[PDB]
Amino acid sequence: LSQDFVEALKAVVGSPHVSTASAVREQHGHDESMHRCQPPDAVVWPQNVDQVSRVASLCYNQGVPIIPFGTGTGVEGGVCAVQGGVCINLTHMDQITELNTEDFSVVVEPGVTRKALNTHLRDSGLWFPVDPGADASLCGMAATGASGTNAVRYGTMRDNVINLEVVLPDGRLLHTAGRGRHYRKSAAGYNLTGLFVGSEGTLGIITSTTLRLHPAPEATVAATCAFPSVQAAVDSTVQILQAAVPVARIEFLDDVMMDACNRHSKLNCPVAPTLFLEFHGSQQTLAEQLQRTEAITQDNGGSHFSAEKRNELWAARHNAWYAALALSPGSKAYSTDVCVPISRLPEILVETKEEIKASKLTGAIVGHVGDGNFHCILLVDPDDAEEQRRVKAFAENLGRRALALGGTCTGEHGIGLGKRQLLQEEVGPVGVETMRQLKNTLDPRGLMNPGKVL
């Protein structure tokens, strides 16, 4: 990157907020994925939307790639600077604006995490429900299309994003539903907001997100239930869903994952395939829901069901990724993320469990089985290229299996670098060309996070 160009960057954001130091670039060259660190040529920290626009326009017109960077917790290599360029760390824009408790909405900048938002909402009766395990940027969650354990009841980011402020690749400012607008539904024109949710930084830079807030539940009960087999746990899950019990959370852990979480959290659950469950409602709803759910799990061989213990339960779940890595310190990991029609979920989870067992790989299974969806967390020796090939082969084959079942190769993590071939198979030639046309119209020079998604 030329010195005159670095100077121009410093004129916009100030010298403390531009760095070409190799250690800074290396920290921003990777995420939580196993994709090899690819350092940007520079990291830039804009202080407001005008500066984001000016940095984008400078990079775009000079032919310099732009990589938006939130909290760097992605798991598909989205922030890897595969073509070099300028990494734009957005987290100094960290303000909550426009809290509208009477409309159940809020506007947040990229430096606001879900925990920061809910802390600011303590005492209001409202909360934001979409809960990835990491304390991620909410605008980053909008960019990846994130979901979480609460999504089965409260929806994904796509369900809860009302409006987006986006700096387009050439610096133009777009408010996807109109500046300052927020409403529960619209038929006005084409839905631009939904195009940018799940775009992973390839269509523009999200500089604020308008989010739907939800009422705190009247009462909450959490429970665990252990099963003799994966099949029993997942059959129970499908029957709970088909009975339309409005569970707030329904998470599956296999025996390997349960053991890992036990050792990482001072939970001490029976080592067995397990459901973590949560119910929201009044005492009457809760009593009724608990009895219908216990009846269903009992029929499939579930054990008997088992506020600070609730926090430890979900803290252990949210840290399952780190619990899995701790089984073999020094390993990295790859995660699958398929989502299938729920009637096919028993087939593919039992099959995945059998394939993990039959192979020499170490893997644990956890996920949002309420949301078509589960993760296979596969461990990899960072210095064993053969094991890396086999893990990648395993992930690819699981992906194709989900696609054969009418599902999708990713329920929530996104495509980044890892799933680009699976995406092509998932939507076919016309779908690929259509997505390419959308990318080309918004990013003609192809400088917006190149090499990702498509």
Ligand X SMILES: Cc1cc2nc3c(=O)[nH]c(=O)nc-3n(C[C@H](O)[C@H](O)[C@H](O)COP(=O)(O)OP(=O)(O)OC[C@H]3O[C@@H](n4cnc5c(N)ncnc54)[C@H](O)[C@@H]3O)c2cc1C
Binding residues vs ligand X (CB under 6 A): 31-32, 67-75, 78-79, 90, 110, 132-134, 136-137, 139-141, 143-144, 146-148, 200-201, 205-206, 321, 412-413, 416, 449, 452
What are the DSSP calls for 168-207, one per residue?
-TTS-EEETT-TT---S---SSS-HHHHHTT-TTSS-EEE
Nearer to ligand X, 297 or 352 (CB): 352
Angle at 270 between CA 265 and CA 274, to 5 degrees: 85
Shortest reach from residue 411's CB to ligand X, in Å: 8
Q: What are phi and psi of 9, to 5 degrees?
A: -65, -45
- On the CB side of 222, CA atoms within 13 Å amount to 15
Nearer to ligand X, 209 or 224 (CB): 209
Cβ(379)–Cβ(333) below 8 Å: yes
Q: Please, which residues have CB within 8 angstroms of residue 147's CB and are 6 or more apart in sequence? A: 130, 132, 156, 157, 368, 371, 373, 411, 412
For the stretch 393-398, contacts whose Cβ atoms lie closer than 8 Å and that sit 24 or more positions apart, written own/partner, are: 394/355, 394/359, 394/361, 394/363, 395/334, 395/336, 396/421, 396/422, 397/355, 398/336, 398/338, 398/348, 398/352, 398/355
Residue 1, CA distances (Å) to 20, 40, 45, 317 in order: 9, 10, 17, 43
Q: Which residue is nearest to ligand X (CB)?
A: 140
Of 47, 48, 62, the C-alpha closest to 8 is: 62
For 68-92, b/e burial (b = at least 16 CB within 10 A) is bbbbbbbbbbbbbbbbbbbbbbbbb
Q: Which residue has the tokens 């990295």?
A: 332
Shortest reach from residue 301's CB to ligand X, in Å: 28
Shortest reach from residue 365's CB to ligand X, in Å: 14
Nearer to ligand X, 139 or 296 (CB): 139
Nearer to ligand X, 232 or 374 (CB): 374
Nearer to ligand X, 18 or 134 (CB): 134
Shortest reach from residue 295's CB to ligand X, in Å: 29
Q: Which residue has the tokens 């079942």?
A: 405
Shortest reach from residue 327's CB to ligand X, in Å: 15
Nearer to ligand X, 296 or 442 (CB): 442
Nearer to ligand X, 39 or 132 (CB): 132
Shortest reach from residue 142's CB to ligand X, in Å: 7
Nearer to ligand X, 132 or 399 (CB): 132
Shortest reach from residue 170's CB to ligand X, in Å: 15
Shortest reach from residue 90's CB to ligand X, in Å: 5
